[PDB]
Ligand SMILES: Cc1cn([C@H]2C[C@H](OP(=O)(O)O)[C@@H](COP(=O)(O)O)O2)c(=O)[nH]c1=O
């Protein structure tokens with residue numbers, strides 16, 4: 717798997733973001749995670765966490781997995797990195813997302829994320845308190 721450039725266009729919520737990728741605007745959905753929707757508990761905090769991660773980044777990258785690159789809604793499915801740090805991992809480690817939507821063939825970073833989730837639950841963070 718490999719990292720490719722992208723630039724912020726705009727925040728959407730905890731697990732979706734609008735990025736410019738290969739010079740085209742696209743909505744991206746983070747692989748292997750589920751943040752609460754804005755209107756749910758820890759939804760606002762998830763959206764704030766991801767928004768901040770992308771605003772503060774000098775460099776954003778997207779990394780597709782081996783399988784499907786777009787979902788049925790036309791959203792890109794990727795691991796996204798902010799200054800080298802994986803958003804997907806960072807959300808789970810903070811208890812602001814669960815591991816979820818693990819489909820065969822797009823699951824390269826599953827166990828990395830599950831390790832992060834175990835550590836978040838151990839610490840009873842956010843969604844696990
Ligand atoms: C994360 C992810 C979501 N999805 C689809 C499945 C879900 O379909 P349904 O909308 O039919 O439930 C939906 C969940 O996204 P959200 O969690 O953003 O709503 O997006 C994928 O198909 N592939 C994926 O890798």
Ligand SMILES: [Ca+2]
Nearest residue numbers: 750751752753
């Ligand atoms: Ca969600």
